[PDB]
Design an enzyme around this catalytic site. Structure first.
Site, PDB file in Angstrom:
ATOM      1  N   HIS A   1     -15.605  83.607  80.387  1.00 46.54           N
ATOM      2  CA  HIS A   1     -15.711  82.336  79.896  1.00 46.54           C
ATOM      3  C   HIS A   1     -14.717  81.793  79.168  1.00 46.54           C
ATOM      4  O   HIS A   1     -14.610  80.445  79.149  1.00 46.54           O
ATOM      5  CB  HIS A   1     -17.011  82.262  78.982  1.00 46.54           C
ATOM      6  CG  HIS A   1     -17.208  81.250  78.105  1.00 46.54           C
ATOM      7  ND1 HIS A   1     -17.581  79.883  78.552  1.00 46.54           N
ATOM      8  CD2 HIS A   1     -16.946  81.043  76.810  1.00 46.54           C
ATOM      9  CE1 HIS A   1     -17.728  79.171  77.591  1.00 46.54           C
ATOM     10  NE2 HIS A   1     -17.180  79.712  76.453  1.00 46.54           N
TER      11      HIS A   1
ATOM     12  N   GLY B   1     -19.718  80.687  68.938  1.00 48.23           N
ATOM     13  CA  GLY B   1     -18.592  81.535  68.804  1.00 48.23           C
ATOM     14  C   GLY B   1     -18.834  82.930  68.914  1.00 48.23           C
ATOM     15  O   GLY B   1     -17.720  83.538  68.672  1.00 48.23           O
TER      16      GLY B   1
ATOM     17  N   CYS C   1     -19.659  84.752  71.545  1.00 44.89           N
ATOM     18  CA  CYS C   1     -19.095  85.295  72.786  1.00 44.89           C
ATOM     19  C   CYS C   1     -17.877  86.485  72.405  1.00 44.89           C
ATOM     20  O   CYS C   1     -17.218  86.316  71.886  1.00 44.89           O
ATOM     21  CB  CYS C   1     -18.723  84.321  73.609  1.00 44.89           C
ATOM     22  SG  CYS C   1     -18.627  84.687  75.400  1.00 44.89           S
TER      23      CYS C   1
END
Lengths: 299, 298
Positions: free
Chosen positions: B40, B141, B143
């Site tokens: 991502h 955030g 991730c």
């Protein structure tokens, strides 16, 4: 969503040591050139009442053994302060974090690093309940396990050392000055803690979390003001609610007032019959306002 | 007593790094000279479906910034493996723990280190559900937050990298090979996970825990064998029970056969109405056999 979490344990792990006196073993905390541990480590093996003043006067330094990850430290001196010992050792912990000592109040959340023989095995968040006990998970050997908080600037607040489990299963500890929370005796006894009160401030936080998750079948349009709720709380196993303005962030978003939530508590006090709120079948006082805000928004 | 705990996080905290590509920031895991992070991080800013192969093909190494506690690591090369990138850096992590990579199975418990901008903020234990999601606590955030177990010999098992939150609130991650658990897509979408089953082996472990705390009002006197329970399990939203002989320790100490607990599961399936088992008002599949054994006897 709401998940009970602990703050990271790394900086506290580096401070946990194994403290042995004779055959007795427990955990201590090594900061600078001082190890703090429960004084239970110098108790004689016996079934009679422990006279710690006598045990302290007959203490010999060579009976101590203090180690960090199997590396033994030399003991220079020992003083007793309430229910703890302060063991001066001959070298300083080079991984001592920036830290202070803080005495908790009922309703405060903190983190427990559960330790066995100087080695951390688990970490979990807990709240100091109104009866000055916590509901931990400790097996034999957890004595001396530390409690802590980590401030935003990175300072570790050292606030708890595990001392004993009461007959009821409730857990009792001291602060790092040696005062036992709730003035319990730091040796086997028949003592029983008082009744636990529901932490109203946390319940209000919980209901705001429910609202933010779209759960509002329970919301009352009745209003009960603070003074009125505190009188009801006396008679119904709840604490007073400390204030209302601290919730204003959540109040604006929802947009439900604290007084509506206080009325909702009185309405839901008995049970949900048999609906749920965020999976709970009865009101939950486990989560603080700070947690709901930080877990919902990072603030 | 039964409390959900996490294993200590110190050895994993020292592997978490901040990974940035252009304006996009998330967390990475620094082991030896490799940083693993969700792919991502190289996604374009857009609302259309992301083509990750095209994003990878147009990748520039100089757009990466990888840092640990404010010091920047030199990026040497990047490869893509399923839903993760492996970023080679020119420094080895001197705090790399003894470690292996392990792929979780449904019903496995593990620990999550929740991280933001490469800094850990919370640690908690979770269970991988039958639909391959977890119930965590992540805000924006998170991730790349890692999941881990620590074996008795000290070896860290790296098993999870946080990937996405589903529309239901459930959380999806990958293993360190880049396989997404449950094969969900690692980008925004409308996907909905299939329904969770009750993890029967965990319910049994939970009931053994209650017996050891003198909580026994719910104990069925009669038994049902495994084959009959597994027939009932299908028709009622429970997984099949694995084996009986794992529970010997708690079968001994109680001393209650698994078949008796299976019968109690059938009886307790509706509700407790309105009694209680160790604080819970319905059956709990949150704790594995291993956790129960570790929390009560070491």
């Amino acid at each position: 969503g709401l998940k009970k979490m602990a703050q990271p344990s790394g900086c506290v792990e580096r401070c946990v040591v194994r403290v042995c006196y004779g055959s007795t073993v427990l955990n201590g905390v090594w900061l600078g050139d001082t190890v703090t541990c429960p004084r239970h480590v110098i108790a004689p093996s016996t079934t009679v009442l422990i006279d710690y003043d006598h045990a302290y006067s007959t203490m010999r330094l060579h009976n101590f053994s203090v180690s960090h990850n199997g590396v033994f430290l030399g003991v220079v001196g020992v003083t007793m302060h309430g229910s703890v010992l302060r063991i001066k050792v001959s070298q300083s912990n080079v991984h001592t974090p920036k830290h202070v000592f803080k005495t908790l109040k009922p309703g405060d959340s903190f983190n427990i690093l559960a330790c066995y023989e100087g080695i951390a095995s688990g970490v979990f968040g807990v709240n100091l309940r109104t009866n000055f006990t916590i509901k931990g998970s400790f097996i034999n050997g957890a004595c001396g396990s530390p409690g802590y908080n980590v401030r935003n600037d990175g300072t570790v607040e050292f606030c708890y050392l595990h001392q004993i489990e009461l007959g009821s299963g409730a857990h009792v500890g001291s602060d790092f000055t040696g005062s036992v929370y709730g003035n319990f005796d730091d040796q086997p006894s028949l003592q029983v803690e008082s009744a636990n009160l529901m932490l109203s401030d946390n319940v209000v936080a919980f209901l705001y979390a429910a609202l933010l998750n779209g759960c509002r079948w329970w919301l009352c349009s009745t209003r009960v003001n603070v003074d009125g709720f505190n009188e009801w709380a006396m008679a119904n196993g709840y604490t007073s609610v400390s204030s209302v303005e601290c919730y204003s962030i959540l109040a604006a978003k929802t947009g439900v007032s604290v007084e509506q939530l206080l009325a909702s508590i009185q309405h839901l006090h008995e049970g949900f019959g048999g609906k749920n709120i965020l999976g709970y079948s009865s009101l939950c006082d486990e989560f603080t306002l700070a947690e709901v805000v930080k877990q919902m928004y990072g603030v």
